[PDB]
């Protein structure tokens, strides 16, 4: 697994051709966006919730947006 | 305190092998395990590695020497003789 | 307490059968079979006993998948010879060649007299 640090790197990671799906896991303290690429599972950790909600609608279309809750 | 009167290093052999054989091996074992002053670096670190092989820990210089002493009295006279014959050979 | 079993069919405490204890997310202790401890290179001088610095110490076949930078040092003979004995070789090479110039000049001025 790989941990994506800032928001921008996650966007073009999710826009890759080998990105199979993105999973959103809502914990008590953070929201994790996990995109399943060919080699690695890229996880982006968002501390707050407004940025997590903003990222939810900005995801590329045609990609599975499975919610883990 | 001085722990033994006369056996010294061969106290490890106990009562075994005979007094004269222990006395004979005593002076060899002392020179075998002694640390000599290295003639290359000047440090007292030249110690026996194997039989006939003497190695210095500091300059990592390995010398071929005697079995129990760093050099034998045989080889020392030989080196002096070879030097004398070499300076006689040339002029 | 929980007692452990080997996870392979090699049942002897040989050098290739070395294990370490690991706690799994299922809260149990298992053997993890470790890799052998790698060694850094020794200097090509063959004199000083320390191993080289700046080189990752791995098993020899792991070096095939390492990048070039991880296997050498940015210097002449880097990754093959230590820094100390490179400096000595640079000095030894230069001073002996300087001596060759001296002996060549010395015999050249010696042959001026018949």
């Amino acid at each position: 697994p790989r941990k994506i640090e800032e928001i921008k790197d996650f966007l073009l990671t999710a826009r890759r051709k080998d990105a199979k799906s993105v999973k959103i896991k809502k914990n008590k303290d953070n929201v994790k966006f996990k995109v399943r690429c060919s080699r690695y599972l890229y996880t982006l950790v968002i501390t707050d919730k407004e940025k997590a909600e903003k990222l939810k609608q900005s995801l590329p279309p045609g990609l599975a947006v499975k919610e883990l809750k | 305190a001085k722990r033994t009167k006369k056996v010294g290093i061969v106290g490890k052999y106990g009562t075994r092998y005979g007094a004269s054989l222990r006395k004979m091996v005593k002076k060899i074992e002392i020179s075998q395990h002694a640390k000599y002053t290295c003639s290359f670096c000047g440090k007292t670190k030249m110690k026996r590695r194997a039989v006939g092989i003497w190695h210095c820990g500091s300059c990592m210089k390995t010398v071929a020497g005697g079995a129990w002493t760093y050099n034998t009295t045989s080889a020392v006279t030989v080196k002096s003789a070879i030097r004398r014959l070499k300076e006689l050979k040339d002029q | 307490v929980q007692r452990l079993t080997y996870r392979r069919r090699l049942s002897y405490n040989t050098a290739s059968n070395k294990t370490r204890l690991s706690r799994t997310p299922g809260n149990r202790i298992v053997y993890l079979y470790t890799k052998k401890v790698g060694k850094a290179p020794k200097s090509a001088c063959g004199v000083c006993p320390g191993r080289l610095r700046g080189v990752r110490a791995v098993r020899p076949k792991v070096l095939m998948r390492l990048s070039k930078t991880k296997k050498h040092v940015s210097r002449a003979y880097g990754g093959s010879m230590c820094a100390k004995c490179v400096r000595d070789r640079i000095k030894r090479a230069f001073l002996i060649e300087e001596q060759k110039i001296v002996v060549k000049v010395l015999k050249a001025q010696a042959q001026s007299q018949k």
Binding site: - | - | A76, R87, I90, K91
Partner: protein, 135 residues
């Protein structure tokens, strides 16, 4: 007396450029409270010109006569002085000590040493300086 002077050929003993021949540009030998040791600004050659023969041709010879240079500030203990010297007129305003705080200037100084070395490598003078030390 003191011999570490500008124009003197030194041998680099440590660093990336170990074993490279080089010329002293400016000796300090007193410290500047930033390098309290004795140091010297040095211009040297990273890549030596290749050997050229008669049966090579003009275009191949000019290709092989190219010199890649470097400029460094070296502690004296990492320099091996030689008896040789080259009177190459390096521009002091271009090759100076404060060239290491701006990469653009360091490129400019390293270019200056390159053109001066190459024209001196031509005409077949200071041949020992431009030969690679074999060690």
């Amino acid at each position: 007396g003191k011999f570490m002077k500008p124009g003197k050929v030194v041998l680099v003993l440590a660093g990336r450029y170990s074993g490279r021949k080089a010329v002293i540009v400016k000796n300090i030998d007193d410290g500047t409270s930033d390098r309290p040791y004795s140091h010297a600004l040095v211009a040297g050659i990273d890549r030596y010109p290749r050997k050229v023969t008669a049966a090579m041709g003009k275009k191949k010879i000019a290709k092989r006569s190219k010199i890649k240079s470097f400029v460094k500030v070296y502690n004296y203990n990492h320099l091996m002085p030689t008896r040789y010297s080259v009177d190459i007129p390096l521009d002091k305003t271009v090759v100076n000590k404060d060239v290491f705080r701006d990469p653009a200037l360091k490129r400019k100084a390293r270019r200056e040493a390159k053109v001066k070395f190459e024209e001196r490598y031509k005409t077949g003078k200071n041949k020992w300086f431009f030969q690679k030390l074999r060690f």
